[PDB]
Design an enzyme around this catalytic site. Structure first.
Site, short mmCIF file in Angstrom:
data_model
loop_
_atom_site.label_atom_id
_atom_site.label_comp_id
_atom_site.label_asym_id
_atom_site.label_seq_id
_atom_site.Cartn_x
_atom_site.Cartn_y
_atom_site.Cartn_z
N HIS A 135 0.78 -1.25 0.00
CA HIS A 135 0.00 0.00 0.00
C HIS A 135 0.81 1.31 0.00
O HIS A 135 0.49 2.24 -0.74
CB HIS A 135 -0.97 0.01 1.19
CG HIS A 135 -2.16 0.90 0.98
ND1 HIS A 135 -2.21 1.87 0.01
CD2 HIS A 135 -3.34 0.97 1.65
CE1 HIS A 135 -3.38 2.50 0.07
NE2 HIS A 135 -4.08 1.97 1.06
N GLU A 192 -4.35 -3.93 -2.05
CA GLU A 192 -3.70 -2.62 -2.18
C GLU A 192 -2.22 -2.72 -2.51
O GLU A 192 -1.35 -2.50 -1.66
CB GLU A 192 -3.91 -1.79 -0.92
CG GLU A 192 -5.37 -1.46 -0.67
CD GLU A 192 -5.68 -1.29 0.79
OE1 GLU A 192 -5.04 -1.97 1.62
OE2 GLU A 192 -6.58 -0.49 1.11
N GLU A 213 -14.53 -4.74 0.12
CA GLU A 213 -14.66 -3.90 1.31
C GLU A 213 -15.76 -2.87 1.11
O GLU A 213 -15.80 -2.18 0.09
CB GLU A 213 -13.35 -3.19 1.63
CG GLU A 213 -12.29 -4.07 2.24
CD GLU A 213 -10.90 -3.49 2.09
OE1 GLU A 213 -10.71 -2.30 2.42
OE2 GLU A 213 -10.00 -4.24 1.66
N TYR A 214 -16.65 -2.78 2.09
CA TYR A 214 -17.69 -1.75 2.10
C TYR A 214 -18.21 -1.54 3.51
O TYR A 214 -17.92 -2.35 4.41
CB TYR A 214 -18.83 -2.09 1.12
CG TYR A 214 -19.87 -3.07 1.63
CD1 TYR A 214 -19.54 -4.40 1.91
CD2 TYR A 214 -21.20 -2.68 1.81
CE1 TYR A 214 -20.49 -5.30 2.38
CE2 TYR A 214 -22.16 -3.57 2.27
CZ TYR A 214 -21.80 -4.88 2.55
OH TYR A 214 -22.75 -5.77 3.01
N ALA A 215 -18.97 -0.46 3.69
CA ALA A 215 -19.57 -0.10 4.98
C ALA A 215 -18.54 -0.04 6.11
O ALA A 215 -18.62 -0.80 7.09
CB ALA A 215 -20.73 -1.04 5.33
N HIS A 216 -17.57 0.86 5.96
CA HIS A 216 -16.52 1.07 6.96
C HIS A 216 -17.14 1.33 8.33
O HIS A 216 -17.66 2.41 8.59
CB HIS A 216 -15.61 2.22 6.54
CG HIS A 216 -14.27 2.20 7.20
ND1 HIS A 216 -13.91 3.10 8.19
CD2 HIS A 216 -13.18 1.42 7.01
CE1 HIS A 216 -12.67 2.86 8.58
NE2 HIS A 216 -12.21 1.84 7.88
N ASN A 239 1.78 7.47 13.65
CA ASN A 239 0.66 6.55 13.81
C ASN A 239 -0.61 7.13 13.20
O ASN A 239 -0.67 8.32 12.87
CB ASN A 239 0.45 6.21 15.29
CG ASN A 239 -0.09 7.38 16.08
OD1 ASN A 239 -1.28 7.69 16.02
ND2 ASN A 239 0.79 8.04 16.84
N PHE A 296 -7.95 4.93 13.67
CA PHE A 296 -8.27 4.33 12.37
C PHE A 296 -8.11 2.81 12.30
O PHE A 296 -8.45 2.19 11.28
CB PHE A 296 -7.50 5.01 11.24
CG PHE A 296 -8.22 6.18 10.63
CD1 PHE A 296 -9.26 5.97 9.72
CD2 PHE A 296 -7.87 7.48 10.96
CE1 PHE A 296 -9.94 7.04 9.16
CE2 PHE A 296 -8.55 8.56 10.40
CZ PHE A 296 -9.58 8.34 9.49
N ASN A 335 -12.36 -0.36 13.36
CA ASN A 335 -13.40 -0.26 12.35
C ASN A 335 -14.33 -1.47 12.43
O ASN A 335 -14.96 -1.85 11.45
CB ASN A 335 -12.79 -0.16 10.95
CG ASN A 335 -11.46 0.58 10.94
OD1 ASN A 335 -10.44 0.02 10.54
ND2 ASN A 335 -11.47 1.84 11.37
MG LIG Z 1 1.26 10.52 12.98
NA NA Z 2 -8.25 -0.01 9.62
#
Ligand SMILES: [Mg+2]
Ligand code: NA
Ligand SMILES: [Mg+2]
Ligand code: NA
Ligand code: NA
Ligand code: NA
Lengths: 409, 204
Positions: free
Chosen positions: B8, B51, B127-130, B187, B191, B194
């Protein structure tokens, strides 16, 4: 009923032009074209006969070709000695579209080699190419967005007799309201209509005079091989008459006659005779083997109307059904009956978002109301039943964006 | 079943996966997966990774699987979700009605995506609906579309469980920690959480 179109007397020479087909094909970027004109004759075949096809742009002659009669070898018995094909090279040709209706003039001279003109026929030529590629309908390599309307030949005073003034008024108004296309619902039109569309600029869907809507079921005649002769003439004689018009981009096999084997035979016939134009037809589900375009009537944008056997799927949903690839242009949509056209923007948001949704034909142009007179001699707009006519479907004849007198709704 | 190939942070994302000098390393992550997991009936689709953009190495390994195991479709999202290295259109976070017309790698309305000129493949969002924090708004919009459209065949929600770790305060009481809470820098804070469930499997 009655004699509702033109009557004429035509004098032709004995040795005559009996038919002529005009075609235009293009290199990848449309900067080169070959105009191909096939000319046919009747009468005595003689060595001294020639055809000259010349191509004019206003007063400037851009191409000319002269050949004797006798076409190429077709089969084991030879070729057509009563025919000839002229091929003219045309550099950087001015293209035809409803946006810019560029026209050339092709003169077809049947003559003696030594320069005696026997007779001459002619037509307006529009250099343009219609093809469906990768699921999209293309005019000159660009995907069309059909801003169309269904048009019946109707006059409040004269009924179904068409005149120039009226025809022009319709085309002025249509183009003034951002229409670029018209459907000949549901028959070949007055000859002058096609000429006007050629000149002002409107994509035409030319439609055979075959409608069997009140049959039970709808394809009872069109599935019947005994009704094939009568049907074929409505398709063939249409093609033979109008195939030279640049404005005609799509052929239609009729309207509301279900899907029958006669629709298949005829679809193939047009594909074989005229490779230049896609054939469409709505009956029997709007996505049958008789049509190159998915052409439903009154299919909604998001809502499925899943009738047995002939469902009207959401146009967005329809395109991506397992295995389906073809373009979708509704032959009929947005029923403009009385106070209507609500939800119209929903269509046009969808048409634009989805490449393979390439527009539709609004139903319809003019209200089919007729003038009647009262005890004081005052004119009023009349509909179904007002002439003692019964059974009648009342005001259902009035579904236009304009009134009978062409006043806008 | 997804290969252990994720690049990624590369610029552009396919720098390694398009590089032939990274083909051996990549192949070992696809080929040794298939050799280990191919008798499991629960495995129905192979994935070339995630990714890593789209490179030549993807197409090679795509074909390797199709040649070795004809029993399972091969899918991969990178490089636009509909490359030549995927049997399934598998976008991440493609919206239902709304187009996100990004340059080069757009995220089309899933409904629009299916009927793009020439497209015939099935669509299942990888992937969907985070489900990050107070999320999953508009989830019903997806499932309405899934049911109405035959070739919209669902998707995989992102994701199952929060990636929070346990830390202890001075009194020895446990609290859920995220990005940063270990002096880790740089960092990406919360995030990592999820999930549809908390780290201890309590439902959101
Ligand atoms: Mg940072
Ligand atoms: Na994540
Ligand atoms: Mg009645
Ligand atoms: Na469109
Ligand atoms: Na009507
Ligand atoms: Na489905």
């Amino acid at each position: 009923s009655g004699i509702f179109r033109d009557v004429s007397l035509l004098h032709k020479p004995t040795t005559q032009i009996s038919d002529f087909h005009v075609a235009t094909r293009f290199n990848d970027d449309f900067s080169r074209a070959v105009l191909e004109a096939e000319v046919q004759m009747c009468g005595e075949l003689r060595d001294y006969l020639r055809v000259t096809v010349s191509l004019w742009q206003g007063e400037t002659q851009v191409a000319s070709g002269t050949a004797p009669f006798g076409g190429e070898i077709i089969d084991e018995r030879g070729g057509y000695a009563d025919r000839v094909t002229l091929r003219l090279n045309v550099e950087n040709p001015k293209l035809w579209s409803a946006e810019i209706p560029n026209l050339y003039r092709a003169v077809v001279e049947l003559h003696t080699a030594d320069g005696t003109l026997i007779e001459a026929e002619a037509c307006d030529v529009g250099f343009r190419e219609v093809r469906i590629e990768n699921g999209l309908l293309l005019l000159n390599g660009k995907p069309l967005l059909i801003r169309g309307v269904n048009r019946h030949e109707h006059h409040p005073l004269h009924g179904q007799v068409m005149d120039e003034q009226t025809m022009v008024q319709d085309i002025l108004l249509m183009k003034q309201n951002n229409f670029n296309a018209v459907r000949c619902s549901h028959y070949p039109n007055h000859p002058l209509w096609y000429t006007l569309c050629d000149r002002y600029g409107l994509y035409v869907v030319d439609e055979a005079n075959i409608v069997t809507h009140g049959m039970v079921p709808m394809n009872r005649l069109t599935d019947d091989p005994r009704w094939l002769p009568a049907m074929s003439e409505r398709v063939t004689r249409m093609v033979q008459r109008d195939r030279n018009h640049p404005s005609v981009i799509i052929w239609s096999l009729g309207n509301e006659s279900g899907h029958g084997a006669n629709h298949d035979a005829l679809y193939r016939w047009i594909k074989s005779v005229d490779p230049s134009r896609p054939v469409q037809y709505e009956g029997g589900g709007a996505d049958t083997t008789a049509t190159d375009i998915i052409c439903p009537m009154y299919a909604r944008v998001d809502e499925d109307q899943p009738f047995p056997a002939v469902p009207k799927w959401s146009i967005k949903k329809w395109l991506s059904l397992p295995g389906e690839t073809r373009p979708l242009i509704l032959c009929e949509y947005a029923h403009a009956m009385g106070n209507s056209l609500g939800g119209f923007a929903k269509y046009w948001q969808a048409f634009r978002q989805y490449p393979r949704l390439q527009g539709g034909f609004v139903w319809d142009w003019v209200d089919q109301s007729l003038i009647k007179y009262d005890e004081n001699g005052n004119p009023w707009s009349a509909y179904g039943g007002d002439f003692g006519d019964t059974p009648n479907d009342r005001q259902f004849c009035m579904n236009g964006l304009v009134f009978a007198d062409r006043t806008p709704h």
